[PDB]
Amino acid sequence: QVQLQESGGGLVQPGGSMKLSCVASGFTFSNYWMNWVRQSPEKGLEWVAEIRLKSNNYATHYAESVKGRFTISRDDSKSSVYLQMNNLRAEDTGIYYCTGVGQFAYWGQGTTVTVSIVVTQESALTTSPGETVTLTCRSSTGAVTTSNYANWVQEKPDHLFTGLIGGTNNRAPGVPARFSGSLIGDKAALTITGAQTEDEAIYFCALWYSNHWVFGGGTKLTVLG
Amino acid sequence: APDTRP
Ligand SMILES: *[C@H]1O[C@H](CO)[C@H](O)[C@H](O)[C@H]1NC(C)=O
């Protein structure tokens, strides 16, 4: 059981500052890049920032939405990643998660911050236990290829995220074999071969474009019967 | 070219 655990969120005024923390355990933290991703009712999942290794001189990249306002950092001696947020805006409101590994296997429980290219997925699909269902993930730029390193992440109730697939078709460890990743008709695709009732969940894809991620809007999968 | 480490 790898664990990630965010802290530092709260209820803040526009214009303010706050620093989030995330402590990791159960894997060799220093060997992996780390990301912040945030969730709002209004904008789904949004990738915020990444930080690479000590051998990359801890190189960082940011979403355009936070560039010049946020700073990501890490302390490998404390197995921790941080997000310094300056000039908070109402639109920064959301649940903030630290996530990484192949490429979004592990997520923390999130810390809530309240301030007061298009990737397309099916809005909803309906299946039943034992069926085969395929979800898809399209890029506005053109065909999805293995150079987009498609990931699939599952959201179960009260914001429990787990990475299922990374690098197009690599199943994260301990992920059930009924889940598989593919490229089909120039989209990325996630197939559940024999859906189970507990697979009722929201499924997000994320695509990589040279130096940043764009998350799709998510598919609500209902499993009836 | 993201973090492809296993
Ligand atoms: C991960 O594996 C890929 C294969 O596309 C490349 O070798 C890449 O350089 C690796 N990157 C990291 C950070 O391990």
Q: Based on the domain organization, do A48 and A86 belong to the same domain? A: yes
Report the distance separating Cα A204 and Cα A159, nearest Å: 13
**C-beta separation of A50 from A149 below 8 A:** no
HSE of A211 in the Cβ direction (CA atoms, 13 Å)? 6
* Structural domain includes residue A222: no
Q: How far B2 CA sits from the closest chain A CA (Å)? A: 7
Q: Based on the domain organization, do A134 and A162 belong to the same domain? A: yes
* Structural domain includes residue A225: no
Q: What is the resolution of this structure in A?
A: 1.7
* Structural domain includes residue A223: no
Q: Which domain holds residue A102?
A: 1-116
A127 lies within 8 A of chain B by CB: no
Method of determination is: X-ray
Sign, Cα dihedral of A39, A79, A11, A87: negative
**C-beta separation of A98 from A6 below 8 A:** yes
Best CA proximity match to A32, nearest among A84, A102, A82? A102
Q: Based on the domain organization, do A155 and A213 belong to the same domain? A: yes
Report the distance separating Cα A55 and Cα A40, nearest Å: 34
**C-beta separation of A159 from A45 below 8 A:** no
Tokens standing for residue A89: 């805006």
Q: Based on the domain organization, do A63 and A167 belong to the same domain? A: no
Residue with tokens 């559940």: A192
Best CA proximity match to A37, nearest among A137, A88, A118, A111? A111
Q: In 10 A of CB A39, how many CB atoms?
A: 21
CATH of the domain at A164: 2.60.40.10
Q: Based on the domain organization, do A141 and A180 belong to the same domain? A: yes
Domain boundary among A116, A131, A153: A116
Q: Based on the domain organization, do A86 and A129 belong to the same domain? A: no
Report how far apart, in Å, the C-alpha atoms of A179 and of each of A13, A142, A215, A219 are. 42, 25, 19, 15
Tokens standing for residue A39: 């969730």
Backbone break loci in chain B, preceding residues, C–N > 2.5 A: none
- For ligand 1, say whether the CB of B6 is within 6 Å of any of its atoms: no
- Inter-chain touch B2–A31, beta carbons under 8 Å: no
Report the distance separating Cα A61 and Cα A55, nearest Å: 16
Residues present in chain B in total:
6
Q: In 10 A of CB A76, how many CB atoms?
A: 15
Report the distance separating Cα A190 and Cα A200, nearest Å: 14
- A76-A78-A80-A83 Cα dihedral, nearest 10 degrees: -100
- Return the bridge partners of A95, or none: A39, A112
Q: In 10 A of CB A121, how many CB atoms?
A: 25
Q: Whose CA is nearest to atom 1 of ligand 1?
A: B4
Region label for A68, one of left (φ > 0), alpha (ψ between -120 and 50) or beta (otherwise): left
**C-beta separation of A12 from A114 below 8 A:** yes
Q: Based on the domain organization, do A96 and A84 belong to the same domain? A: yes
Best CA proximity match to A33, nearest among A105, A109, A83, A101? A101
Q: Based on the domain organization, do A87 and A180 belong to the same domain? A: no
Q: Based on the domain organization, do A19 and A111 belong to the same domain? A: yes
Q: Based on the domain organization, do A86 and A127 belong to the same domain? A: no
Residues of A in contact with B6 (CB under 8 A): 102
Tokens standing for residue A147: 């150079």
Report the distance separating Cα A18 and Cα A10, nearest Å: 9
Report the distance separating Cα B5 and Cα A111, nearest Å: 27
SS3 A51: strand
Measure CA A78 to chain center: 23
In terms of CA atoms, which chain B residue is nearest residue A103?
B3
Report how far apart, in Å, the C-alpha atoms of A90 and of each of A40, A48, A94, A139, A204 are. 11, 16, 10, 28, 24
Domain boundary among A116, A141, A171: A116
Q: How many domains does chain A have?
A: 2
Q: Based on the domain organization, do A64 and A168 belong to the same domain? A: no
Q: Which residues contact A175 (CB under 8 A, 6 or more apart)?
A: A162, A163, A164, A165
